[PDB]
Amino acid sequence: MKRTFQPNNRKRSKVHGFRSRMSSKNGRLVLARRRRKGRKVLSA
Amino acid sequence: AIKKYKPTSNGRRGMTTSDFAEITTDKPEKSLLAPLHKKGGRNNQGKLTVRHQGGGHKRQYRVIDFKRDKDGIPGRVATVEYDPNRSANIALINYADGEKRYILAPKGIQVGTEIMSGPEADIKVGNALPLINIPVGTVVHNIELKPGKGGQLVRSAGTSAQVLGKEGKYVLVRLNSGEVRMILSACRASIGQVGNEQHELINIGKAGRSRWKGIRPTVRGSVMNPNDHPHGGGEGRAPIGRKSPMSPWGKPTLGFKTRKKKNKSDKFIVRRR
Amino acid sequence: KDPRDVLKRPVITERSADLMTEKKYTFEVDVRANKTEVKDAVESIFGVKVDKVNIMNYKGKSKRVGRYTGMTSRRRKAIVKLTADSKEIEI
RNA sequence: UCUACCCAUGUCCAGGGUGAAGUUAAUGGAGGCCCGAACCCACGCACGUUGAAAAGUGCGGGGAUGAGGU
RNA sequence: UGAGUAGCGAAAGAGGGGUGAGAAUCCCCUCCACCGAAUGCCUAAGGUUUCCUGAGGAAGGCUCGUCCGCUCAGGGUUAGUCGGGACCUAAGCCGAGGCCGAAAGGCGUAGGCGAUGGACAACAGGUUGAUAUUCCUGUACCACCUCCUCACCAUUUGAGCAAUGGGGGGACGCAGGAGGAUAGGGUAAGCGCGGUAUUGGAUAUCCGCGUCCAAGCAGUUAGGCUGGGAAAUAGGCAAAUCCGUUUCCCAAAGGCUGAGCUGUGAUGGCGAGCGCGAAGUUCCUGAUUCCACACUGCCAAGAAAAGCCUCUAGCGAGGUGAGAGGUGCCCGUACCGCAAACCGACACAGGUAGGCGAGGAGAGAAUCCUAAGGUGAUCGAGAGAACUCUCGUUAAGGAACUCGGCAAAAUGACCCCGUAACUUCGGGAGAAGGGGUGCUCUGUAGGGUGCAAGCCCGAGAGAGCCGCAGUGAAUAGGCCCAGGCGACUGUUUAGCAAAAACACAGGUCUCUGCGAAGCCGUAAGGCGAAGUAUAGGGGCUGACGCCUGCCCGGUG
RNA sequence: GAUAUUGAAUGUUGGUAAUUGACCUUCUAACCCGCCGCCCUUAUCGGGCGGGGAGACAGUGUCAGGUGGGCAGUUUGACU
Ligand SMILES: [K+]
Ligand SMILES: [K+]
Ligand SMILES: [K+]
Ligand SMILES: [K+]
Ligand SMILES: [K+]
Ligand SMILES: [K+]
Ligand SMILES: [K+]
Ligand SMILES: [Mg+2]
Ligand SMILES: [Mg+2]
Ligand SMILES: [Mg+2]
Ligand SMILES: [Mg+2]
Ligand SMILES: [Mg+2]
Ligand SMILES: [Mg+2]
Ligand SMILES: [Mg+2]
Ligand SMILES: [Mg+2]
Ligand SMILES: [Mg+2]
Ligand SMILES: [Mg+2]
Ligand SMILES: [Mg+2]
Ligand SMILES: [Mg+2]
Ligand SMILES: [Mg+2]
Ligand SMILES: [Mg+2]
Ligand SMILES: [Mg+2]
Ligand SMILES: [Mg+2]
Ligand SMILES: [Mg+2]
Ligand SMILES: [Mg+2]
Ligand SMILES: [Mg+2]
Ligand SMILES: [Mg+2]
Ligand SMILES: [Mg+2]
Ligand SMILES: [Mg+2]
Ligand SMILES: [Mg+2]
Ligand SMILES: [Mg+2]
Ligand SMILES: [Mg+2]
Ligand SMILES: [Mg+2]
Ligand SMILES: [Mg+2]
Ligand SMILES: [Mg+2]
Ligand SMILES: [Mg+2]
Ligand SMILES: [Mg+2]
Ligand SMILES: [Mg+2]
Ligand SMILES: [Mg+2]
Ligand SMILES: [Mg+2]
Ligand SMILES: [Mg+2]
Ligand SMILES: [Mg+2]
Ligand SMILES: [Mg+2]
Ligand SMILES: [Mg+2]
Ligand SMILES: [Mg+2]
Ligand SMILES: [Mg+2]
Ligand SMILES: [Mg+2]
Ligand SMILES: [Mg+2]
Ligand SMILES: [Mg+2]
Ligand SMILES: [Mg+2]
Ligand SMILES: [Mg+2]
Ligand SMILES: [Mg+2]
């Protein structure tokens, strides 16, 4: 059975990566929150 | 002529086709082609805004000269060709100066026919004149609405309009719909009926053939649910069960006129269809 | 840049010892150094004639000392073939 | 990154059969044509039901040049 | 607690030898068994050191463990030519100015980004424990460069270079069939090497194994398309000796391309076998590959841009061609990749694109057994109760079972004969229903290939032989009569409904004159459509045939 | 529909003492053009300039009425 997670590093980076986050106000808020929480990993 | 297929399968039962007797070449003119991708009825937001459009065969766009603005230079009809982008056939014109252009193929045009644009042109099928120069009773196609813009009206296979009278700056034209309308006399029209008159007789024959033409299935409102359509729901089959039949977006859709009531062109329209 | 910034240290392995019989010298080089810079660096320092430089990148190896996981440094390894009529490097 | 539909660009479909138009009985090779693997599907039954598996397996089943699969 | 209970996750092992504190489980050997259009080989994505070597055995491994995808050390990935970048563009995405919008922002032009496509120079052999068009050997090719060499042309109608511009080209669908050719196959013949058997027989028409070779360069070719020349030119944002068009003049040439083949490459390499090394030919078969979307047919009418060629515009005192010498960066390269290494919490009967995919019999990638190659499955040993599951057989009967023939049984291949109602004249149809089917001899008739020996293919008979049974296994329709529904192929409730539901071709009504109507959006901007009433949106009906009456008071 | 953006004339018909209304037709100069040519400019955006079309209409703002399950928040009693 084909399961939901089908890994693809290009698609991971394009959808969830740093440049994607930086390209919008709301993505920049994601990064601001994760920095505020003190996450090691800010993005994919 | 309309070729009828023999019923060698249930798909083929009743299916008919053009014999394509008018078409003189299989290959288009490479210089007059442009790319044309499908849209699936999706707009610039990526959202479906027109239903029932998608798929079908890949097509190249043929750049048609709707303007017909090479006044004075004679043009020889080189080919009559299939165009996937429209019901009419198109004709490759070799102008005497060595420019090549496509036009809409009128009814009964032939390879080797000389054609001419401009006010000095003859009233012969294929020519394109300002409506001021076209005499009353002349059957025309490819009518301009604004001078220089290009023909917009009466372009589909077999369609035709008739010049009824000249009111100075405007000319009266009976359009294909039966509407009578004032067109600016400076606007061009092409002489004749549009070719491929049999087009409407074609029996598509099978579901798949509509799919090849980029038509996805229509689902009736009555077999949707209430959240989808005004006609949706009901236990078993249901009648319309409403004052009027309704569109998916909740407007009356049988008899309800949708032409804007304050329209600038209302003054130009003499008799409605 | 300095030649001696390019070449970090020699690779002393059984493989690299076998390459030295064929007149090929294996160096760890700066991770940014292209093979032209490596060629120029070897000729400058050792005063030899290089035939060709083959170069490869090694990823960092995952490593553990007790609970703490981590990575070794990534490495750039250059295999420098000297010409037939050339002086040998003294390692 | 599942899935629905769409868009661009690739690619896949052993074999056999039937024999439309047209052409001159032969020739010709049409088809959401037929039989049938791959592939896609999921009709019946059994089994499984703290499973080998949070939807499967086994034996049969449908489609298989198309409104096709991927 | 349940309980020493359920379970230990599809599968063939046996013995001998070894190692060790310890061995069903690790190593080696032998025979046996399993996969073999894969359970083989290659390679994506994904994983990220799992790879190799040595050491280890706490935990992980459903048992064990000396072993391991586990632990600890150390090691391992080599490129001008492969894949990606220093090339091109599609969808889409971003988007200077710009348009629009309480803010945030939305949209969009120029311009870019973006492969799943276009373009683009390297092959064969060898080698390591672990990489190999990457290293090594041999033999190449591509772009660029000039301390040099040689030849030729030229210094203002003056060589030559040449656009970011023009043109050509690139450049495209689907189906079908015939050619040409090559992989691959057969070992048919010939050739080479080894063997002559002790189980009755055999120098036998005996046995086993092997029986080739690259890119490149030169030549050639089935062939494929293409009509060419000369003037003149309302066009190709300027110009054009290019393209387009026209008129004259010749209808075979010229172009452009070609799979492959032949020579060479090769005094080399590989090679049965025993570092050395024989023969290394011909014949037959033959693609799903290539020539090639080439041809023919068809309608649903089949990307772009660059490389490339050409044209001028420009640029120009030195150029052009050939040789010789030289230069050539970055990223990936280990290993798994139908899997115990990826997605499924697991060393999970599931899922995972693409290339190659042998033989016998065969139409075949079916089927059964095998080849190359891979593998024996991570708990075992007994016993052979009930019961459950998966199978096999069954007297007499034969649907009496049951909601229902559910399940099972039966049918099944090829050939010949024969084939109804009804019908939209296609069908129905493999209707139904009969008969044949092995082996031997005549030994083939005939066909393909070839110069010919020969090698394949091969009816139809006649006479014989054997068995209970001849498509002797595996794999291969059960059929018929009548009725409801839906015309039909399709589609659907991922995971209890596949249907009579949806769709459908066809019908009809209605809206819509183009800044169309309809639709998305506050708008800009879009879809509609680069369409234009034979078109587009919406409602209803649903092939086809015959038809579709009455009522306009109410509501629209 | 009123009103603003919104101007100019000619008629005709009100009401006040010659100005201000109402409506008709015409005009062009605001406004509009998903029309053509030229330029910014290698540009199917945008802007400028010149034609043409339309024109004080339309569009847009404010206000008003109608329509409006298209959408929203809710109500839809208790005894038994
Ligand atoms: K039909
Ligand atoms: K429908
Ligand atoms: K209903
Ligand atoms: K098989
Ligand atoms: K070990
Ligand atoms: K490698
Ligand atoms: K349905
Ligand atoms: Mg529709
Ligand atoms: Mg329903
Ligand atoms: Mg509703
Ligand atoms: Mg209803
Ligand atoms: Mg009812
Ligand atoms: Mg490298
Ligand atoms: Mg079929
Ligand atoms: Mg699959
Ligand atoms: Mg499904
Ligand atoms: Mg089938
Ligand atoms: Mg016990
Ligand atoms: Mg118990
Ligand atoms: Mg028990
Ligand atoms: Mg047990
Ligand atoms: Mg097991
Ligand atoms: Mg077997
Ligand atoms: Mg290992
Ligand atoms: Mg254990
Ligand atoms: Mg490349
Ligand atoms: Mg944008
Ligand atoms: Mg900006
Ligand atoms: Mg690619
Ligand atoms: Mg290449
Ligand atoms: Mg390896
Ligand atoms: Mg490898
Ligand atoms: Mg598995
Ligand atoms: Mg065979
Ligand atoms: Mg086989
Ligand atoms: Mg019995
Ligand atoms: Mg019996
Ligand atoms: Mg009974
Ligand atoms: Mg009973
Ligand atoms: Mg049954
Ligand atoms: Mg049906
Ligand atoms: Mg279901
Ligand atoms: Mg079901
Ligand atoms: Mg608009
Ligand atoms: Mg548009
Ligand atoms: Mg219905
Ligand atoms: Mg009626
Ligand atoms: Mg009435
Ligand atoms: Mg409500
Ligand atoms: Mg509330
Ligand atoms: Mg109550
Ligand atoms: Mg009561």
Author numbering:
A (entry chain 2): 1 to 44
B (entry chain C): 2 to 274
C (entry chain T): 2 to 92
Give the article text.
Cryo-EM structures reveal that YlmH binds peptidyl-tRNA-50S complexes in a position analogous to that of S4-domain-containing protein RqcP, and that, similarly to RqcP, YlmH can co-habit with RqcH. Consistently, we show that YlmH can assume the role of RqcP in RQC by facilitating the addition of poly-alanine tails to truncated nascent polypeptides. Unlike B. subtilis RqcP that is 86 aa and comprises only a single S4 domain, B. subtilis YlmH is 257 aa and comprises three domains. In addition to the C-terminal S4 domain (residues 171–257), YlmH contains an N-terminal domain (NTD, residues 1–74) as well as central domain (residues 87–166).
Given the well-defined density for YlmH and the presence of P-site tRNA, class 1 was subjected to further rounds of 3D classification, eventually yielding a well-defined YlmH-50S state (‘State 1’ with 66113 particles, 2.7% of the total) containing YlmH and P-site tRNA. State 1 could be refined to generate a structure of the YlmH-50S complex with an average resolution of 2.0 Å. The excellent quality of the cryo-EM map density for State 1, particularly within the core of the 50S subunit, enabled the identification of nine distinct modifications within the 23S rRNA. While the NTD and C-terminal S4 domain were generally well-resolved (2.5–3.5 Å), enabling sidechains to be modelled with high confidence for the regions interacting with the rRNA, the central RRM domain linking the N- and C-terminal domains was less well-resolved (3.5–5 Å), enabling only rigid body fitting of an AlphaFold homology model. As expected, the C-terminal S4 domain of YlmH is located similarly on the 50S subunit to RqcP, where it interacts with both the P-site tRNA and H69 of the 23S rRNA. As a result, YlmH establishes additional interactions with the P-site tRNA from residues located in the loop between β-strands β4 and β5. In State 1, we observed additional density within the polypeptide exit tunnel, which is better resolved in the upper region of the tunnel and becomes disordered, probably due to flexibility, towards the tunnel exit. The density for the nascent chain at the PTC is consistent with four alanine residues extending from the CCA-end of the P-site tRNA. We also observed density for the antibiotic chloramphenicol bound within the A-site of the PTC. Chloramphenicol is a context-specific inhibitor that binds stably to the A-site of the PTC when alanine (and to a lesser extent serine or threonine) is present in the –1 position of the nascent chain, providing an explanation for the observed co-migration of YlmH with 50S subunits on sucrose gradients in the presence of this antibiotic.
